[PDB]
Amino acid sequence: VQFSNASYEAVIMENLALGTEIVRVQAYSNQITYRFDAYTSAQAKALFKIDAITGVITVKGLVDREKGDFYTLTVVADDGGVDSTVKVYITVLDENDNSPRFDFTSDSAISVPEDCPVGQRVATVKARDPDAGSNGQVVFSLASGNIAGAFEIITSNDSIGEVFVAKPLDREELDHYILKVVASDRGTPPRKKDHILQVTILDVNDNPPVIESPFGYNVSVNEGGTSVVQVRATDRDIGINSVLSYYITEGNEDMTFRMDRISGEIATRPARQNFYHLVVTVEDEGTPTLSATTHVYVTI
Ligand SMILES: [Ca+2]
Ligand SMILES: [Ca+2]
Ligand SMILES: [Ca+2]
Ligand SMILES: [Ca+2]
Ligand SMILES: [Ca+2]
Ligand SMILES: [Ca+2]
Numbered sequence: 001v002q003f004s005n006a007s008y009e010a011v012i013m014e015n016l017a018l019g020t021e022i023v024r025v026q027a028y029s030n031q032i033t034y035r036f037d038a039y040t041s042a043q044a045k046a047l048f049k050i051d052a053i054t055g056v057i058t059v060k061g062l063v064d065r066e067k068g069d070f071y072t073l074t075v076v077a078d079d080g081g082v083d084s085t086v087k088v089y090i091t092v093l094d095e096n097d098n099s100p101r102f103d104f105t106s107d108s109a110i111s112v113p114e115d116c117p118v119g120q121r122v123a124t125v126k127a128r129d130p131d132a133g134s135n136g137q138v139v140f141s142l143a144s145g146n147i148a149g150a151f152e153i154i155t156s157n158d159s160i161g162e163v164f165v166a167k168p169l170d171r172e173e174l175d176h177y178i179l180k181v182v183a184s185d186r187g188t189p190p191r192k193k194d195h196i197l198q199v200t201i202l203d204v205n206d207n208p209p210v211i212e213s214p215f216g217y218n219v220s221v222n223e224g225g226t227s228v229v230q231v232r233a234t235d236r237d238i239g240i241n242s243v244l245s246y247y248i249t250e251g252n253e254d255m256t257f258r259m260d261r262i263s264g265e266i267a268t269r270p271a272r273q274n275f276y277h278l279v280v281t282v283e284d285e286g287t288p289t290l291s292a293t294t295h296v297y298v299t300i
Contacts, residue, residue, distance in 0.1 A: 001084050003027050003077065008088040010057075014065040014095050018058075022048070025055035027077030027084060037074040037085055044071045048090070057088060065092045066130045094132035096187035102127045102195045106181075107163070109198040114171040115206065122151070123163035123197055127183035134186040143194065144180040151179060151199070163197065171201040172236050205286025207236035209244050216295035223268050228257065228298055231264040233282040241286035248296075250279035257298070266296060275299055 004026040012022055025034055034055040036045055048071065049060040057073065073088040107123035116122060129136045140153040140161035152166035161181065177199035184190045212232040219229045235242035246264035248257060256276060259266050266278070278296040283289050 001027070001029065001077075001079065003084065003086045005086070007086060008075075009091075010088070011091045011093060012059075012063060013093050014063050015097060016059050016063055018060065020059040022057050022059065022090065023088060025050065025057070025075045025077070025086060025088065027055070027079075027086075030079040030081060033078045033080070035076050035078065037076050040074050041071070043068065044073055044090075047071065048073060050075060063092055065094050065132065066098065068092065069094075069132075094135055096131055096135040096185065096191060098129055098131050098136075098185075099191040100127040100129045100138045100183035100185055100193045102183065102193065106195060107197055108195070109200075111200045111202055112165070112169065113202045113204055114169045115204045116165050116169060118165050118168060120165050121162050122165060122199070125153075125161040125163070125181055125183075125195060125197070126159060127161070127193065127195075128159065129183075129185045129191075131185065131187070134188070137186045138183050139186065141182045141184065142179050143182040145178040147174055147177060150174075150177060153181065169201055171203050171238075172207065175201045177201075203238045203241050205237055205241040205284060205288065205290060207241070208290035209233040209235050209282040209284055209292045211282065211292050211294040213294070216297070218297045220299045221268065222300065224270050226268045228266045228268065229296060231259075231266065231280050231282070231294060231296065233264070233292060235284050235290075237284065237286060241284060243285040245283045245285065247281045247283070248278050249281045251277045266298075273300070 008023045010022045033052045034050050047061040050057050069092045071090040074085050076083045103126040106125040110123050112122050127138045137158040140155045142153050150167050153161045153163050179197040181195040181197050184192045217229045221228050245261050248259045257266050258269050276298040280294045283291045
């Protein structure tokens with residue numbers, strides 16, 4: 001009718017082996033038998049058992065702190081003669097038994113213009129770890145593919161990773177990244193999960209046409225429609241940012257010459273001076289418009 005103690009307490013690690021003895025209830029007057037009362041939860045009765053004779057409570061099931069960190073058992077001491085009851089309080093401590101998992105709201109493929117300023121945010125990732133304290137805090141890093149330190153990841157709220165431009169980008173040097181984002185917990189030792197973020201670098205019109213002849217063109221013609229010279233230029237950008245237009249902008253007031261806008265070929269017009277100094281402008285078709293100038297000196 002009386003118990004060895006006012007209540008019983010035990011502190012156990014989650015995932016403790018089945019059969020582990022956690023506490024012994026003892027009552028005294030007649031044989032005494034021990035059992036859980038009717039009100040003790042189904043969840044608790046699946047995890048713990050009490051020996052009818054000894055009063056020893058053992059681990060019966062898989063104790064998972066992420067499913068519950070505290071149980072109240074009520075134990076009946078039946079002398080076969082209402083029976084006395086006593087409370088048993090079980091605290092469950094944390095194992096670092098979970099790795100971070102990325103949420104599906106995490107960016108996995110982004111497009112960044114190569115003139116994206118240092119400090120601008122280009123992506124966010126989110127990860128969770130259901131362990132307790134340090135075992136559940138998440139910190140992000142860029143473990144590989146972060147060529148020349150282009151990007152940096154900053155962690156908020158042990159939960160969100162913000163990806164920023166850390167160094168100026170240049171599509172003409174590197175037009176894509178495969179960043180291996182790592183979510184680590186702060187367990188000792190830590191558990192980690194990786195996530196791939198693909199970065200495509202978009203072109204800006206940041207390269208001018210470059211004239212292939214550094215000193216311009218010096219030519220003699222002795223012609224109606226006779227080709228005189230082809231001006232050529234290149235451009236390091238792509239798409240419309242490297243599509244070139246060729247114009248004669250000065251020295252052709254008497255209309256002796258024609259320049260094909262696309263090919264840069266100069267011809268005499270179908271149709272007087274012994275000498276012409278043509279100025280040629282080459283423009284790309286991007287924004288802002290970039291251009292180069294060259295000189296074409298024509299002797300007839
Ligand atoms: Ca667990
Ligand atoms: Ca963890
Ligand atoms: Ca845990
Ligand atoms: Ca560039
Ligand atoms: Ca460019
Ligand atoms: Ca260009």
